[PDB]
């Protein structure tokens, strides 16, 4: 199953098809490589009706649509429109010779009768007018013309990044696994030895596959981390294609937008200084090299706009003007915000209704905007569905599904359903998430339809889910149950033979307390671009502590973790040696005009992190009440490394608009292989170390509080993943803040908690 790409709930529209029961995908597979009445290009596999659909189309000749219990399965030779070597098991849709001239099609026996056709190589592929190399010839893939004084001719086609690598292997395919040095390559999906934040989950279209050397983060060219426990990660030696490499678009000698598709020759600034080479370090040393920017055209001293400048700009000759822009003559997308509410939004029936912000999805996944046709081409557009409130990345119903849903940013799955619970305007019968675990009484559909039992094989016949295949499961009677961790939750097969199974709704049982970083006030969710943070919506960040002098003053932050447990930085209390100089403040929005019944409590005990760190534990002298307004923070797992670009809140109310209140900032996070670039931390930062910030467009000062907390969402609650500490680095201009990363503090907390 290496030779094809899958997509979990996608279906396309065949005329050229063959249905037959299947007991699984390899099952499946093999039909298709059997190739009995036509050359199957891609299966459809139905786990729960053990269907096997074979197809002669894929998603470049046949219309996607979404689908309940199905996984696409596409072979990749039939995708891919570039070649390797000679071309030989090319199978694109080139239909033009390298001199512009259409091809002939090989089953037509005029202007050319030809040598090479269906009928005498049927294994050839030799399919409409597409170039093809049936022959073996060491020139590539070619067609005959249409021309009647020219035979047939060679074609251009792109070579595939499987051999060799384009520009800086971004879009390396390849399955060389080692390092320059000879050390192995750790998994992706692997955070053992080397914890990191390039999870191929949270990076699905960045081809993030087995332990193969990529180029996710803009690196000279492609890497890898090593299994070797002291050296992180390693450059890997790829070879270089001779080839042209993909095409950039169409180029202009004269200014469009922003500049990035300029070509021309002008080698002068703004005020008239003479151009420095891209190939030169003198008067200016810069990574603006054509080594770091190969299919970026950085050739002679010509003005260009490699990394998204406002014009096309240049180094200049003059060593007391660093760079300026070019003044060319005229000629005449970005991830949405994490606007998921963790106060989880509801819907009412069948969610149609349902306009809230939420963007995630039952197991986690982000959804793709309903303008992008990037990883699913669709038509659940705002044109074709004017009154679905098709805007943003949000969870929607436009074609009436049981519930609302989006299509996911995840390539190899197409929709998912969302992480809403029905509105509520026997109380135990209830699930947990997707209700795998479930054993209630339910056995009633979203259309009322009566379940079929388990164990019956009539309307619908089964070999998988009966109480003898799946005993763990709990299948009895007719009870509505989630054996196959389905996305939608519990089901059951239907008594209508002409649905297979449908949908039980299953209401979440309720949390018996307040649980771990989830905010009973919705955050004001401050916008990244904002000047200073914004003013947090009281009560929004329960967690947050504020730690007093004993004269009364707010001094430094700090994190309720556990109803006894206070987490801060060691800088805060570097001036006095005793727990009893100390109060903790819970429950506040104002700084020095505390509200009425916010929580003061005395500090008992302090704990200095062992290995000298800026982190530390507060005991409390009597234990916390958790309330609406005071909730601790949930502590994530033992080295957990945060996904890079990752969106996250600092919180405090710091040194000073809104004097004196809780203040909120948004700040991604970096992945510390690309903070500790020469250009940037240059390898100051280590694992027990967090960056958070721009590395561009600097505020040039000490947020929030020291001690401080630094919160990331993930599905449906905020996980403290950073403490604010000042001497680590503060956010400067186009330099990151460092923050200690909690999660490898986690075990230390944890026996401290236990044992204390
Ligand atoms: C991508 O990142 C940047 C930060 O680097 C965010 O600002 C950006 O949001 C958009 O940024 C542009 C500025 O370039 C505008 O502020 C934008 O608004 C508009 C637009 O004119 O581009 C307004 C328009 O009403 C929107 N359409 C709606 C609401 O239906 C469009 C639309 O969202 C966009 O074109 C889709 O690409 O945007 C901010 O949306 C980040 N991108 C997103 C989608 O948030
Ligand atoms: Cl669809
Ligand atoms: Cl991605
Ligand atoms: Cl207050
Ligand atoms: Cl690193
Ligand atoms: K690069």
Redesign the pocket.
Same mark, same amino acid.
């Not at 997308?333 to 915000?337: K, L, Q, V, Y």
């Given at each position: 199953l290496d030779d094809y790409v899958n997509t979990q709930g996608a279906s396309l529209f065949s005329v050229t098809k063959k249905q037959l029961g299947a007991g699984s995908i390899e099952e499946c597979a093999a039909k298709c490589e059997e190739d009995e009445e036509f050359t199957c290009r891609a299966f459809q596999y139905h786990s729960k009706e053990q269907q096997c659909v074979i197809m002669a189309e894929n998603r470049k000749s046949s219309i996607i649509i979404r689908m309940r219990d199905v996984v696409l399965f596409e072979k990749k030779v039939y995708l891919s429109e570039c070649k390797t070597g000679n071309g030989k098991n090319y199978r694109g849709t080139m239909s033009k010779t390298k001199n512009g001239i259409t091809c002939q099609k090989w089953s037509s026996t005029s202007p050319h009768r030809p040598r090479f056709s269906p009928a005498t190589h049927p294994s050839e592929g030799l399919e409409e007018n597409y170039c093809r190399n049936p022959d073996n010839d060491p020139q590539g893939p070619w067609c005959y013309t249409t021309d009647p004084e020219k035979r047939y001719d060679y074609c251009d086609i792109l070579e595939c990044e499987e051999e060799c690598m384009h520009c800086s292997g971004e879009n390396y395919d390849g399955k060389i696994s080692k390092t320059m040095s000879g050390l192995e390559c750790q998994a992706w999906d692997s955070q053992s030895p080397h914890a990191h934040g390039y999870i191929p989950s949270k990076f699905p279209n960045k081809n993030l596959k087995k332990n193969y050397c990529r180029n996710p983060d803009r690196e000279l060219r492609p890497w890898c981390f090593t299994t070797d426990p002291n050296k992180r990660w390693e450059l890997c030696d790829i070879p270089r294609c001779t080839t042209p490499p993909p095409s950039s678009g169409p180029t202009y000698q004269c200014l469009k937008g922003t500049g990035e598709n300029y070509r021309g020759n002008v080698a002068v600034t703004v005020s008239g200084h003479t151009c420095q080479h891209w190939s030169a370090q003198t008067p200016h040393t810069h990574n603006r090299t054509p080594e770091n920017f190969p299919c970026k055209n950085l050739d002679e001293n010509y003005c260009r706009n490699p990394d998204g400048k406002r014009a096309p700009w240049c180094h200049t000759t003059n060593s007391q003007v660093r760079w300026e822009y070019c003044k060319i003559p005229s000629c005449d !997308?970005?991830? !949405? !915000?994490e606007l998921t509410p963790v106060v989880q939004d509801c819907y009412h029936g069948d969610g149609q209704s349902y306009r809230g912000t939420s963007s995630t999805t039952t197991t986690g996944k982000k959804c793709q905007?309903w303008?992008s046709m990037t990883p699913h081409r669709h038509q659940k557009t705002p044109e074709n569905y004017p009154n679905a409130g098709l805007?943003?990345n949000y969870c929607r119903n436009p074609d009436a599904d049981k519930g609302p849903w989006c299509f996911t940013t995840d390539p190899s799955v197409r929709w998912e359903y969302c992480n809403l619970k029905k509105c509520s305007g026997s109380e135990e019968d209830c699930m947990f998430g997707n209700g795998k675990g479930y054993r209630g009484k339910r056995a009633t559909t979203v259309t009322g339809t009566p379940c079929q039992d388990w164990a019956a094989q009539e309307p619908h016949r089964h070999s998988i889910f009966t109480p003898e295949t799946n005993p763990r499961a709990g299948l009895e009677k007719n009870y509505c149950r989630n054996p196959d961790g389905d996305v939608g939750g519990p089901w059951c097969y239907t008594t209508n033979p002409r649905k297979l199974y449908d949908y039980c709704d299953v209401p979440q049982c309720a949390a018996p307390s307040f649980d771990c970083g989830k905010p009973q006030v919705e955050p004001k969710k401050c916008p990244?671009?904002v000047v200073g943070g914004c003013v947090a919506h009281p009560h929004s960040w329960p967690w947050q502590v504020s730690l007093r002098t004993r004269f009364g003053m707010h001094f430094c932050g700090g994190t309720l973790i556990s109803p006894e447990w206070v987490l801060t930085a060691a800088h805060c209390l570097e001036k006095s040696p005793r727990p009893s100089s100390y109060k903790v403040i819970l429950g506040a929005h104002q700084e020095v005009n505390l509200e009425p019944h916010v929580q003061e409590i005395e500090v008992s005990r302090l704990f200095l992190e062992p290995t000298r760190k800026d982190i530390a534990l507060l005991k409390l002298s009597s234990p916390a009440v958790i309330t609406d307004k005071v909730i601790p923070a949930c502590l994530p797992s033992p080295n957990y490394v945060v996904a890079d670009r990752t969106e996250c809140f600092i919180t405090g109310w710091g040194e000073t608009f809104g004097a004196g209140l809780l203040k909120e900032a948004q700040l991604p996070v970096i992945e510390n292989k690309v903070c500790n670039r020469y250009e940037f931390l240059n390898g100051r930062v280590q694992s027990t170390e967090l960056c958070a910030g721009h590395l561009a467009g600097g505020t040039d000062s000490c947020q929030g509080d020291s001690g401080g907390p630094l919160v990331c969402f993930e599905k449906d609650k905020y996980i403290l993943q950073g403490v604010t500490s000042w001497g680590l680095g503060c956010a400067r201009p186009n330099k990151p803040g460092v923050y200690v990363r909690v999660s490898r503090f986690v075990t230390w907390i944890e026996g401290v908690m236990r044992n204390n």
């Open positions: !997308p970005t991830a !949405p !915000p905007s303008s805007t943003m990244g671009r």
